[PDB]
């Protein structure tokens, strides 16, 4: 299912994808800040600590056909091992993934946005938001 950016926060009960804008400086010049890593930030990841959580993150070129064959590229994963905490039932955390090499490999360096796919593997988890920044 394709989800708008304003649909977050969301419960990640199934695989979803969303269009994420690259940083604003890239709109003017696609090689702006070329010696800095371009970082995908998944914010507000929230779940019960006693629930094992895993989801995988993929990226694809925004111009690919969603009704066409999968051209998604693995970017990273979020994992939590079940545990208890002396004063918290839940964890609220973040995942940051480097995109610079990935965008070159998928040949999306000229694009202003990308598609991010989140693939739940186990555990109930909320995703607060997604952005790309330096
Ligand atoms: Ca493209
Ligand atoms: Cl926390």
Numbering used by the authors: 369 to 502
What did the study's authors say about this model?
Tyrosinases (TYRs, EC 1.14.18.1 and EC 1.10.3.1) and catechol oxidases (COs, EC 1.10.3.1) are type III copper‐containing metalloenzymes that constitute the class of polyphenol oxidases (PPOs). Herein, we investigated the activation of PPO1 from Malus domestica (MdPPO1) and present a novel activation mode for plant PPOs driven by self‐cleavage, which is independent of external proteases or any other harsh conditions (e.g., SDS).
To corroborate this result, an orthogonal experiment was performed, where the sole C‐terminal domain was recombinantly overexpressed (Csole‐domain) and crystallized. The bound metal was identified as Ca2+ based on the composition of the used expression media and buffers, the interacting amino acids, the binding geometry, and the presence of anomalous signal. This binding site is absent in the C‐terminal domain still attached to the pro‐enzyme. Moreover, pro‐MdPPO1 was incubated with different amounts of Csole‐domain to investigate whether the C‐terminal domain plays a role in the self‐cleavage process. The results clearly demonstrate that the addition of (external) Csole‐terminal domain significantly increases the self‐cleavage rate as with increasing concentration of external Csole‐domain, the pro‐enzyme is cleaved into its active and C‐terminal domain faster.
